[PDB]
UniProtKB/Swiss-Prot annotation, chain A:
GO (cellular component) term, any one: P-body
The protein's name: Eukaryotic translation initiation factor 4E type 2
GO biological process terms on file: miRNA-mediated gene silencing by inhibition of translation; negative regulation of translation; negative regulation of translational initiation; negative regulation of type I interferon-mediated signaling pathway; rescue of stalled ribosome; translational initiation
N6-acetyllysine modification, residue list: K89
Function: Recognizes and binds the 7-methylguanosine-containing mRNA cap during an early step in the initiation. Acts as a repressor of translation initiation. In contrast to EIF4E, it is unable to bind eIF4G (EIF4G1, EIF4G2 or EIF4G3), suggesting that it acts by competing with EIF4E and block assembly of eIF4F at the cap. In P-bodies, component of a complex that promotes miRNA-mediated translational repression. Involved in virus-induced host response by mediating miRNA MIR34A-induced translational silencing which controls IFNB1 production by a negative feedback mechanism.
Positions annotated to bind mRNA: Y33, E34, H65, W79, E80, R129, F130, Q131, E132, D133, I134
Principal location: cytoplasm
Domain of life: Eukaryota
Family per similarity comment: Belongs to the eukaryotic initiation factor 4E family.
Name of the coding gene: EIF4E2
Effect listed in the UniProt record for changing K85R: Does not affect ubiquitination by ARIH1
Keywords: Acetylation, Cytoplasm, Initiation factor, Isopeptide bond, Phosphoprotein, Protein biosynthesis, RNA-binding, RNA-mediated gene silencing, Translation regulation, Ubl conjugation
Taxonomic source organism: Homo sapiens
Residues represented out of the complete protein: 52 to 221 of 245
UniProtKB/Swiss-Prot annotation, chain B:
Gene name in the database record: GIGYF2
Residues of the signal peptide: none
Protein name: GRB10-interacting GYF protein 2
Subunit (UniProt): Component of the 4EHP-GYF2 complex, at least composed of EIF4E2, GIGYF2 and ZNF598. Interacts (via the 4EHP-binding motif) with EIF4E2; the interaction is direct. Interacts with ZFP36/TTP (via P-P-P-P-G repeats); the interaction is direct. Interacts with GRB10. Interacts (via DDX6 motif) with DDX6 (via RecA-like domain 2).
Motif 4EHP-binding motif: chain residues: 5-15
Outcome recorded upon mutating N21S: Probable risk factor for PARK11
Disease: Parkinson disease 11: A complex neurodegenerative disorder characterized by bradykinesia, resting tremor, muscular rigidity and postural instability, as well as by a clinically significant response to treatment with levodopa. The pathology involves the loss of dopaminergic neurons in the substantia nigra and the presence of Lewy bodies (intraneuronal accumulations of aggregated proteins), in surviving neurons in various areas of the brain.
Native source species: Homo sapiens (Human)
Similarity section: Belongs to the GIGYF family.
Its biological purpose: Key component of the 4EHP-GYF2 complex, a multiprotein complex that acts as a repressor of translation initiation. In the 4EHP-GYF2 complex, acts as a factor that bridges EIF4E2 to ZFP36/TTP, linking translation repression with mRNA decay. Also recruits and bridges the association of the 4EHP complex with the decapping effector protein DDX6, which is required for the ZFP36/TTP-mediated down-regulation of AU-rich mRNA. May act cooperatively with GRB10 to regulate tyrosine kinase receptor signaling, including IGF1 and insulin receptors.
Length: 176, 37
């Protein structure tokens, strides 16, 4: 679990890794539809983060329909969570082979407090699919245009992506 | 304006990556076998 240790470098928040997988079809796979999400663990320092991250496969090497989620401790990676329900996310769709580096850059910027939006960040997701990967960063208030504008600028600055790459913002409710 | 108390850039994060660690016990679950290295 997460403890603050004098010899270690604290993060501004504790964060929790999550892992989900979806067996997407009844015809598509021989097995029946199945969906699972499991909390991996929670960490409080830079050194503790590396203990977890260095022992996880990079997302570009996951198979099937799988996701890593990295969210502030106490925020579930589900839009209906209190911390998320009035929020939204920046979405970046990537051709296969780019997600592992972009995920690392994203979560290092998030954990390191590089966004400068106070408490607005909820967490980040990398979703591995068959023909593309999707990376997103979620924030608390979807209607806070100044916040969501600052996140975009930091993303463009820290992610190291071709300037042709599109980014889209989506408010979680808009899905209903 | 208001800087966070604990701030690290990318290079600072990598600088603290200790090369001798122990896998957290939270990861030692059969469910995570596909994702362990």
């Amino acid at each position: 679990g997460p403890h603050m240790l004098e010899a270690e470098h604290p993060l501004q928040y504790n964060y929790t890794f999550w892992y989900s997988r979806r067996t997407p079809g009844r015809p598509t796979s021989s097995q029946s539809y199945e969906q699972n999400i499991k909390q991996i663990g929670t960490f409080a320092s830079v050194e503790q983060f590396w203990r977890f991250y260095s022992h996880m496969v990079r997302p570009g090497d996951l198979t099937g329909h799988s996701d890593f989620h990295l969210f502030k401790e106490g925020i579930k990676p589900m839009w209906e969570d209190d911390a998320n329900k009035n929020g939204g996310k920046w979405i970046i769709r990537l051709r296969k082979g780019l997600a592992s580096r972009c995920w690392e850059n994203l979560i290092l910027a998030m954990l390191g407090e590089q966004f400068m939006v106070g408490e607005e960040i909820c967490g980040a997701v990398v979703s591995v699919r068959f023909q593309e990967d999707i990376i997103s960063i979620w924030n608390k208030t979807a209607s806070d245009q100044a916040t969501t504008a600052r996140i975009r600028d930091t993303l463009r600055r820290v992610l190291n992506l071709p300037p042709n790459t599109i980014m889209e913002y989506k408010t979680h409710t808009d899905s209903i | 304006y208001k800087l966070a108390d604990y701030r690290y850039g990318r290079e600072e994060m990598l600088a603290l990556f200790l090369k001798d660690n122990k896998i957290p016990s939270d990861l030692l679950d059969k469910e995570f076998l596909p994702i362990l290295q």
